[PDB]
Every structure is written in C-alpha cells, then in structure tokens.
C-alpha cells in the first residue's frame, strides 16, 4: 500500500503543497474553485474515478 497524495498546487517559484481531499480545502484550492470557477482536476496528479 501506499499514499502519494490525490491534488498539487503552487504560490509562485512552482509546485509548493500537495493534499488528499481530506479536512478542509487548502487556500489556494478553495480560491481556483470560487474565484476563478475550476473544479479538482486542474490540481489532480493520481486517481478521480
């Protein structure tokens, strides 16, 4: 078994903070779903079946 993670996002020098979906949304996820209108998959990096 294993856990590489399931989302990856950046701030500004590239790729900063990866997450899983679990607890609440991180920042920058939160601010692409709301103020720019994306959804999961412009962050997803394994697995959205």
Excluded: C, H
């Amino acid at each position: 078994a294993a856990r590489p993670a399931k989302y990856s996002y950046v701030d500004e020098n590239g790729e900063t903070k990866t997450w899983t979906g679990q607890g609440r949304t991180p920042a920058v996820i939160k601010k692409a779903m709301e103020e720019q209108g994306k959804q999961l998959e412009d962050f997803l990096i394994k697995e959205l079946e």
